[PDB]
Each structure stands twice: as structure tokens, then as C-alpha cells.
Amino acid sequence: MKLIIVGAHSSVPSGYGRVMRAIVPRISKAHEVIVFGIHAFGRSVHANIEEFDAQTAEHVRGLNEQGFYYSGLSEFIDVHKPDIVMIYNDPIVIGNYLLAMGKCSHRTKIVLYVDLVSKNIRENLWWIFSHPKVVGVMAMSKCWISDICNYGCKVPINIVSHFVDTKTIYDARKLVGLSEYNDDVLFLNMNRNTARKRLDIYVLAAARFISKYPDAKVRFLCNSHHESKFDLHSIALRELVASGVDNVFTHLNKIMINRTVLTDERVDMMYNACDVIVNCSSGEGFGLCSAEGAVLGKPLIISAVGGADDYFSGDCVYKIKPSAWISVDDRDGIGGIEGIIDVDDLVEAFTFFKDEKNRKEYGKRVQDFVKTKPTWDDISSDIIDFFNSLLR
Amino acid sequence: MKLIIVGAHSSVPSGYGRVMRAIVPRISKAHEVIVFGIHAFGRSVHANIEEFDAQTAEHVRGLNEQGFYYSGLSEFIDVHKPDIVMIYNDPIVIGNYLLAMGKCSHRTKIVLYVDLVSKNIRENLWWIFSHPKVVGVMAMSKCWISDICNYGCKVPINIVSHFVDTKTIYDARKLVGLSEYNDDVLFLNMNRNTARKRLDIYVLAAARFISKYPDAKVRFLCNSHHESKFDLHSIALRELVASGVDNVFTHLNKIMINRTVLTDERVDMMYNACDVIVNCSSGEGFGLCSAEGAVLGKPLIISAVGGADDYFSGDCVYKIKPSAWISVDDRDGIGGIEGIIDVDDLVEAFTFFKDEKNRKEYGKRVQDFVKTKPTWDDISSDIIDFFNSLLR
Numbered sequence A, B: 001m002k003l004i005i006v007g008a009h010s011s012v013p014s015g016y017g018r019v020m021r022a023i024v025p026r027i028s029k030a031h032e033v034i035v036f037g038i039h040a041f042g043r044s045v046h047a048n049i050e051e052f053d054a055q056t057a058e059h060v061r062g063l064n065e066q067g068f069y070y071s072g073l074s075e076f077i078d079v080h081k082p083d084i085v086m087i088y089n090d091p092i093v094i095g096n097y098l099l100a101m102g103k104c105s106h107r108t109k110i111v112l113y114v115d116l117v118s119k120n121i122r123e124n125l126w127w128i129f130s131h132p133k134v135v136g137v138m139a140m141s142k143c144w145i146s147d148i149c150n151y152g153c154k155v156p157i158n159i160v161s162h163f164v165d166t167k168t169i170y171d172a173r174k175l176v177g178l179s180e181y182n183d184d185v186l187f188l189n190m191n192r193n194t195a196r197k198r199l200d201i202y203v204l205a206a207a208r209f210i211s212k213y214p215d216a217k218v219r220f221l222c223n224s225h226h227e228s229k230f231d232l233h234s235i236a237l238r239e240l241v242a243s244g245v246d247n248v249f250t251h252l253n254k255i256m257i258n259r260t261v262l263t264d265e266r267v268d269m270m271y272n273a274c275d276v277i278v279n280c281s282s283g284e285g286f287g288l289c290s291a292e293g294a295v296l297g298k299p300l301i302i303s304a305v306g307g308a309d310d311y312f313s314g315d316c317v318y319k320i321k322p323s324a325w326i327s328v329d330d331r332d333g334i335g336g337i338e339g340i341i342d343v344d345d346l347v348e349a350f351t352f353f354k355d356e357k358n359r360k361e362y363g364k365r366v367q368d369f370v371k372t373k374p375t376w377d378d379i380s381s382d383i384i385d386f387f388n389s390l391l392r
């Protein structure tokens, strides 16, 4: 069959671009595939398969539609006359795409691959799952099935998770310039400083732990870009002052904040250099910044939310259940509800993993578990198996 | 003594407006008090005490200092030459007035009436507690004393709480327009639809309670302005669909939003009308609203936060403890951390008070307990004692 995939361009170094570099060349040997690549930063990584540069074509026609190029998708499908059109992004973006090709010449058969991260997304977006043209839906996890079914979806739903592979680098500690901290156990959170990822709880818990164990050789690593909503050292300073502990400043310095944007391998070096990988976010479609440490044999503390909860655990990970629920509607146009973990639960989780006997045991568990997990070849073969069932 | 209070003008229908209307006339008989009244809505409510209309004077000088009239305070103090100056606001506003009188000619003693609302307010505001002109600090509740100390306060700290004066009104639900709901038990949340107040939780717990008991004669009431940030019916609607319960739109109608602003009479009428008073906010300095329903012998469900926790005995009231803690830095320039109750805990509370024998019992309990509290005259006298102590 002739397939059209509407998603991130192969040049994009994002979460979406990561999977598009992997999934497309694997379906190329199964079906004739042509791509509608968006937000293109440079040239096409693939040498053979046809890919449309939607950002440059938008620049040529004289538009600034953020790089998505909705207005030209109508003309694009009419020429390429596909058997199946796949859409891969968050609720909002699909909503604009289906609105754009409402007057599209070819009678195609639409498949959705939604980026869902929170339950109870806004009502003005559920119409995409009931769309009389969408014949198939792809979810990132088992947890989203019930939701997608609640949003009024009468068509077959297929689970399409992700696989990940980080470079295993020996002597990583020294190479990222952490040589001075050889004695300390290092906790890592690679998540970006946004509300969803709740680094305020991370940094909050770090301060509680440090205050009750002021002499533990430990460091807490995290990232943050210029003047984002949470000032992480400021949050930690205030909780250390409230705790009554002496040497607030030296204790505060135990939280190490990276501000520069790293290369793909500095990220890999960072993963190898550390001892515990942490994610305490309120919403997860999948949670790449955790699975990436599981292959290296690092023990894991995760919030039991969304995709992370389904993907993990034969009791191989430290899972913290959300203690409360709030509305996320003020965050963005997607909205919904998310689960917040208790900070003190994160403190319990930390003291658990300052014991090296524990890090060794669970780090061995996660690696042996993620061994069984489906690779990109297993996943992409499941993608086409779902496509064949919708034609005959 | 000559005393100047920088605070809300008589006409202001806010939290600060209410306590200013009560405190000023009572200090007037002991001392000469003149008011730098800010944010005026019109005529001064007091016939004889001197109240300065700071907002209109601001307009006369063609300034827009949001009715605070920072530019005017310095000159106002130099003229009146008061013995003491009381600044009654939050830390940012106090900060700004302190800089305003930075180049003041009159040597004067400053007393701060701080409205705190969360632990861990930003450190760049802490300076106001150890400002050299600051001679004393007044706080609203016992819980805030240890925070102000942690912030580095070396001056006397006094507790100045609040009293509540709501009239008892006969035939109340007929008068507010709720005569169609005689059999229904009415839960009342009088709080403003802001983030702090967590009406997203209230509404969400209402939805979960309704889906649990579809035929329970119950109504939930709350408030919201033109275009706030939580669309309450939206949150409610989405949760009902999730539970799978039928007759969604009728069940949704049980949650009643009041968009219309209310006069002092109608607020009092609402309290009289309803069967259970609810406050599920993540931050309270003292926590008016709930205390307003307690003098009428109405049962209260409250979040055990800030001043609400100090003020009510756990035996006379249904207290819910926070389950999770989050940063608030994104909300305001003040910031801090606040505690959030579990939505399922609020459900337990709602089902506890659907039985009338519990409402009768806990109603009698609060009325008897709040009876033993200090009145406004007890509070005003304590205020004037504190000032005398600081003078000689």
C-alpha cells in the first residue's frame, strides 16, 4: 500500500523526531512510504524514501504557520492519493490537520497516533477520535485505551510503545568533569524544567533529605533553561532555611543545575556518570527520561503516572503513587488532570537508594526486565500488522 | 497616640476591606487613627474618622500606581508626623511602601500586618522583616510566627487574628432563589475561583460523589468571574464521562456556579441558606468564609492549611490534611509552597455529611466552639496594647 505519514521531520532532534528516524526506514521495506516532515532543521537523514519539507515550502509560499503547514496538506494528498494517512502529535495539532484536509480530494483512510500525557483532555478535542474518516487509532500505552474509548472512539485501537538505546560509556564520571564528586552517589533527573515534570518536588525532596542527612555524600542533578517558572536553587534554599540545618549554602550546592543544552552523547555520558535516575513528573505518555537509564543498569525512582506505570515493574523499580490530583487546564490548551506525588515519598525513595546494596539489586532488575522489551524492529512490525488488518 | 494605617479603603469588598472596617472604628476611641485608604470603590463608610482616598488622589496627579499611590505615602507621613505607621498587606506591597518611605523626612516606627498565605515565600522579600524602621510585626495566626522568625525577624511578633460577624437570617433559601431545591442538601463554597482556592478539586470531588451516588438529592454551589482560569463545568463534565455514569447533563446541573457578584447581604443569605460549608484551598492566612458559616451552626469541611488549621479544633470540624506539596512560585511574585488535599478525601467528607445526624452534631459543635473565640473588641484592644508596648 501507499502510506502517507504526517509527522516530525528526520532532522528534528526531539522526542517525536527520535521515533520518526527509527520507524520510517523500517516500514520502507514493508510498504511504499512518503513522509510529510514538519519543523525541518536541515536536510533529510534518509537517502531513498521520499520526504516533503513542510517548513521550507511554508517559507516559499509566504506563511508562518509555525512549521506545521496545514494549508498545503490538502494539495499534497490529492497528488499522492494514499491508502492510509497517519497523524502523529498532540491533540491540538491533529485537530488543525483534520480541519485542513476536510476538503481533500482523495478519499483516504486516516490513522491517529496521539501524544497523550494527561487524563480528561478538553472536550473541544475529543471529536478527532470520533472523526468519521479515522478507521484506526494508535496509542503509546495500554492506559490510554480506556480514555480514547471514553472520548467516543468506535474504531480498533492498537498499542504502539517505544524502544530506546543509549550508548554505554565507561569512565563517564571523569569525562563530564564530575571527577571531584567521585565519592558521592549521584541522583539524576534529565527532564526539562516545565510544570508537568515537577522539578519543584525533586528539588524540594533533595533539600528535605539533605537536611535530615546533612553528611551523606550525595549530589542531586537536574536541568533548567533561562528564567523558567521554577527557580530551583531558590526553592531548595527556602526549604533548607525552614529545616533549621546549618551550612545552608554548602548543602544547597549539592543540587547541581545544568543550564546549557547538551549534545546527544553528553546526555549519554550524563546517564552513565550517575547512580540513580529519577522522574517525579505529574504526566507521562511514555517517559523516555527513565527508560534510557534502565538499559544501563541504573536503579529507578519514577512517579507511577501514565505510560511510565504500564511500561515498568515486576517490582524492578521504585514506583511512587500520586497522592493528590489537580487540574492542569491552566497549563496549556490541552488541559486535563494529573497526579501529584508526595514529596516525603520521594525522600523515602532517596534514603532507600543511598544504600549501595539496593542500587545494585534494582539496577540488575531493570536491565534484565528491559531486555525483554520490544525493539524498534518489533514495534515497526506491529505497526504494519495493524495496517494490514484494516485493509483486508 | 497618632496612628496611620496603610490599608484597604472602607468601600473595598475584599478580605482586607472587611477587617479594616472593623478594626479602625474600634482603635478610634482609644487613639487618633487616620487612614491611607487604598483601592477605593467610592464613598467612605465612616462618618467621622479621617480616611484618605489614595486612588483618586493618584488620579488627580495623573498616575497609575494601581490605586496603591506609592508616590504619595512619603509626603503623607511627613505631614501627619504619626507616632506609628501600620502597613497591612502582602510582602510585595509592604516592600514597595517601605521603599516609598525610604526617603521620608519624619522618623517613625513601622508595624507590619503581614498577610502570609504559604510557607517559604521568596527570599528576595525577606528583607522587609528586618528593615531598620520596622519595630514590630503582627501576624494573623500562630502558624506564621515560626516562618517570620526563619525569615530573620528580630522584633516583637504579635498575633492579631480575625473575628466574624454574619447575621442569622430566617427563610434564607427562599430569598436567594433556591426554592426549587428544598429536598436537596446544599454544599457551599464561597471562595473565589483562583488557583489557591482549588475549586478544580471541589468540582472534581463533586463529580466523583455524584457518579458514586446518582440519586442522592444534593447540590454543590461555588463562584466564578467573567473569564478566570478554571472552567468549572468543563472540569465537572469531563470527570462524569470518565466514570461512565448515565444522565450526564442532569448530573452536571447539580453543580451551580454563581457568576454574579454578591452584596454583603446576599453573601450572608447564602451562608444561612446552605447545609454544609466547604473550603478546600491550598493556602489560608486565617481563612474567612469557613469561619463565617461556623457562627450559624453549619458543618464545615476544611483543608487543614495555614490559619484554618490553627483556628478550628479537629473535633468540631471535618479537617482534611494535605496529601501533596507543590511550589507556588508560578502563581505570584510572592510564591511559596502549598499543600493539596486528595480529591477522594473530599468525597469521603461529602458522603460523611450527606447524613443529617452528622450535620446536626458538627453544626452544634462549631457554633459552641467559635463562640469561645476572641471578638473584634478583644482583638482591637490587643492591637492597641501592642502599640503602647512598642512606644514606652
Ligand SMILES: Nc1nc2c(ncn2[C@@H]2O[C@H](COP(=O)(O)OP(=O)(O)O[C@H]3O[C@H](CO)[C@@H](O)[C@H](O)[C@@H]3O)[C@@H](O)[C@H]2O)c(=O)[nH]1
Pocket (backbone or CB within 6 Å): A013, A014, A015, A016, A115, A116, A117, A190, A191, A192, A260, A261, A262, A263, A264, A265, A267, A283, A284, A285, A286, A287, A288, A289, A292, A307
Ligand atoms: N540532545 C539533547 N537531548 C536532550 C537534552 N535534554 C533532554 N534531552 C532528551 O530529550 C528527550 C525528551 O524526552 P521526554 O522528556 O520523555 O519527552 P517530552 O518532552 O516529555 O514529551 C513527550 O515525548 C515522549 C513521546 O514521544 C513521551 O516519553 C513523553 O511522555 C511526552 O509525551 C529525552 O530523550 C532526553 O534524553 C539535551 O540537553 N540535549
Ligand SMILES: Nc1nc2c(ncn2[C@@H]2O[C@H](COP(=O)(O)OP(=O)(O)O[C@H]3O[C@H](CO)[C@@H](O)[C@H](O)[C@@H]3O)[C@@H](O)[C@H]2O)c(=O)[nH]1
Pocket (backbone or CB within 6 Å): B013, B014, B015, B016, B018, B019, B115, B116, B117, B162, B190, B261, B262, B263, B264, B267, B283, B284, B285, B286, B287, B288, B289, B290, B292, B307
Ligand atoms: N462584599 C463581598 N464580600 C465577599 C464576597 N465573596 C467573598 N467575600 C468576603 O471575602 C472575605 C475574605 O476572604 P478570605 O477567606 O479571608 O480569603 P482572602 O481574603 O482572598 O485571602 C487572604 O486574606 C485574609 C487576610 O485578612 C485571610 O483571612 C485569608 O486567610 C488569606 O490570607 C470573606 O469574609 C468573605 O465574606 C462577595 O461576593 N462580596
